[model samples]
Target: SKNVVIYADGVYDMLHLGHMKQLEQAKKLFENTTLIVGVTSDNETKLFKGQVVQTLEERTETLKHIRWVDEIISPCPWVVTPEFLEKYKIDYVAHDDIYAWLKRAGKFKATQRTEGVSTTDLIVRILKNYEDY
Candidate 1:
C-alpha cells in the first residue's frame, strides 16, 4: 500500500546484460518500487534438469551489486506462496514469460525477454566455438 514491492526470482548464476535489461523493465513498473531478487540454489537447479555454474552465495553477491536490485534472497523457494509474499511485503511479481509457478500463482507482471541472449545460450555458444573464446 505504501510502496510497491516487486519480486523477481531466478537462478541468476551468470550475470549478463540480458538480466540487467529485464531488471530495468521491472524497476519501471511502479513508483517507489523495491526489486527483490530471489536466487535459486545450485541444488534447486537440478529440479529443472539444469546445472548452475555459480554457487548460491556467488550468485547472490553478483546480483547485490546490480543498481536496480534492492534486495536479494538466496536459496529462494521454487514456489512463491502467499506467505512468502506477505512476509516480504511483495505487492507483485515480474516475469519475462518464464516460471510457470508465477503464472499459476496469479500475481505477476509480464515483461519481455532480452533478444537472442541467455545464460544457456551463452554456454552453448562457448562450447560450440571452443577455440574462439
Candidate 2:
C-alpha cells in the first residue's frame, strides 16, 4: 500500500527549537502521515545565500535526531517538481506562507512559522554574543 507522506523542505541549518516546532506542527496535519524533511544541498543554499554555516551532511545529521522527522532527503532540490512529488509519493507539501509559488499552485499546506526564533535570528544572536554563547 502507498504511504501518506508530507514534505517539509528547508535548509535546516541551525536545527533550532523553531525547526523542531515546525515539524511537530506539520505532523498534526494528517494522521498516519510521514513527515519527510528535505535538506537542501550546501551548493543549493549557496546559490541564493552565498554561504551557509552548516554543511548538508551536518544539517542532515542534526535533523535525524528530531523524532518528528521520519525520513531525510539529503541534497534535496531547491525547487519542487512534479517528478519529485511522484518519486517521493508525497501527498502534500507543507510550508509557511513565504512560498508564493506554492501558494499560487494551491497544492501546499501552510503552517505558522515559529515566532521570535529562526536560523537567521540564532546566527545573529551567536554573533552578537560570541563570547557568551
Candidate 3:
C-alpha cells in the first residue's frame, strides 16, 4: 500500500536543531510516511550561493543520522519541479519559506506559524546567536 509522503528540501549545510525539529514534525504528521529530504548538491550550492561549506556526502551522512528522515533525494535543482512531484508520488511538500511559490501554485501545504518559530527566525538566531560559539 502507498503511504503518505512528505517532501522537504534544503542546503542542510551544517544540520542543526531546526532541521531536527522539522523532521520530528514531519514524522509526527505522517507516522509511517516517507520523509524525503532533497539535499542541495555541493556544485549547485556554489553556483547558486557563490559559496558552499558542506560537501554533498557530508550532508547526506548527517541527514542519515536523523531518525525522522526516512529517505534522501536529490535537491530539486533548488526547487521541487513537476517531474519530482509526479515521480515521487509526493502527496505533500512542506517548506520553511514564509512566502513560497508553492502556495502560488495552490498545490502545497504551508506552515506559516508554529510555536512562534519560523524557519527564517530560526536561521537568523543560529547565524547570529551562534556566530561566535
Candidate 4:
C-alpha cells in the first residue's frame, strides 16, 4: 500500500563481500523500499550455528555502514512470524533462507548467493596463515 517495507537478516559474523552483495540486491530489488537489516543476537546464533567470530556490537555496527540499509533490528527474531511482520509492517523478506516462515506466506524473495566467499572461508584462511606464520 505504502512503501514496500523489506526485511533482511544475517549473523554477519565476519561481514564479508558475500553478505554485502546479498544485502545490496535485497535493497535494490524494489523500486522503493524501506529496507531493514536484522542482526541476529549472539546467543541465538551460537545456539544454532557454530561460534561467532564477532560480537553483537561488532556485527550490528558492521552492517550500519552499508548504504542500502535504512534501519536495523538488533536481536532480530530467528523465526520471523506473521505477527512479527505485522508489527514491523514488513511486506517482503529478502533472504536466502527458504525454510523460514515467510516462504510459506509467499512474502520471501531470495537473491543469488555469492559463492566464492564466506565467513568460514575467511576464518579458515586466517587460521591457516597464522599456523604457517
Candidate 5:
C-alpha cells in the first residue's frame, strides 16, 4: 500500500492549538499516511462537553484547512466498532482506548493530550481576558 490510513476523532467544538498539534502528530505518525478526522455530532458532544460553541459543520470546516488533515467525516460515532474499521479502511485508530476490541487487535494508537490548551481553557482565557482580549 502507498499509505497508512489514520483516523482521529473529536468534538472539535472550538478548534485550537491542541487540536492542531494532535492532528499534526497523527499526520506525521507514519512516513506515508492518510489522516482522516472524524467530527462527532453536536448531540453527542452536549452529553460529554455540554453546549458546544460550534455545530458539526463548523467543526468539520475547521479540519478542512489543517495541513495534516486529508479527509473529514462528520458525525463520527463515539465508539468505533469492527464494521466501522472495515468500512473506513482504517489502519490505525488514533486517540483512544474507546475502540471496541481495537486495542486487543493492535489497531489502536494514542496521541498526546496537549498541555495548557483545550476548549474549556480557551473559554477561561477569553472570559478572563474580557477586560484584556
Candidate 6:
C-alpha cells in the first residue's frame, strides 16, 4: 500500500514529547500519512468522561504545528465513520488500544498501544505525587 493514506485521532492536549514520539512512529508506518487529530470541543467535553484542558483553538494550533500532522478535525459523534473514511480516502488506520475500534471498522493496519506510556496516566501520576507537596 505505497499510496495508502494513514490517519490517527485523539485529544492531544499539552502536546508532550510522548505525542511527538507516537506521531513520529505513525508517520513512518505509511508512505503517505495524514494525521487527523480530533480535539474535543468545549460543548462535547461536557458530555464526555474526561477533561479538555486545552481549548479547541489551542489544540488545533498545537496539532497543526506538529511536523507529523497533515490536518486536524473536530471530535466527531462517532469514533469511526463511513464518511470519515470517504472524506480522507484513508486506506489505513493507526492508533492505540483504546482506539481498537479501527479493527472493527475494517481498516486497521497497525497498532502501537504504547506498552508503558499514556498522557492521562502520566498526568495522573504527576498530580498524585505533587498533591501533598
Best by TM-score: 5
Q: Compose the digit string of candidate 5's lDDT tens values, residues 1-133.
A: 4799999998877788998999999888889999999999998878876788888988888889999999888989877788988999999988832455878998988788787898778778878966753
Q: What's the lDDT for residue 111 in model 4?
A: 83
Tell me the tens digit of each residue's lDDT in model 1 across 1-133.
Answer: 3678899888886888888888888987887799998998788687674877888889898888899999888889887788999899887899873456666766779877787687778788879866764
Displacement of residue 76 (Cα, Å) in model 5 is 1.3
In candidate 2, stretches whose alpha carbon ends up further than 4 angstroms from where it belongs are 1-3, 97-106, 119-133
Query: How high is the lDDT of residue 18 in model 2?
Result: 90
Deviating ranges (above 4 Å) for candidate 1: 97-106, 119-133
TM-score of each: 0.80, 0.80, 0.71, 0.84, 0.85, 0.71
lDDT of 5: 0.86
lDDT of 6 by residue, 50-110 (tens): 6778887887787877898776776544356767788878766777665556677778766
Task: Please give the range of 10 consecutive residues that has the lowest summed lDDT in model 5.
Answer: 93-102
TM-score of 1: 0.80
Task: Write candidate 4's Cα lDDT for 1-133 as tens digits.
Answer: 3578899987988887898899889998878888998899999899997788789899998889989889999979887788989999988988774455677787988887898698778767778766644
Better of 2 and 4 by lDDT: 4
Whole-model Cα lDDT of every candidate shown, in order: 0.83, 0.84, 0.73, 0.86, 0.86, 0.69
- Write one digit per residue (lDDT tens) for candidate 3, span 1-133: 4588888777877777767787777766655688888888888788876666778888888889999888898544675676778898877887756336557765465433245454457778778866565
Worst 10 residues of 6 by lDDT: 109-118
Q: Could you give candidate 2's per-residue lDDT for residues 1-133 as a string of tens digits? A: 4456889988887778898998998877876789989999988689876678988999999999999999999989888887898898888888883456556766589877777787678768778866763
The list of candidate 5 runs beyond 4 A from truth reads: 119-123, 126-133
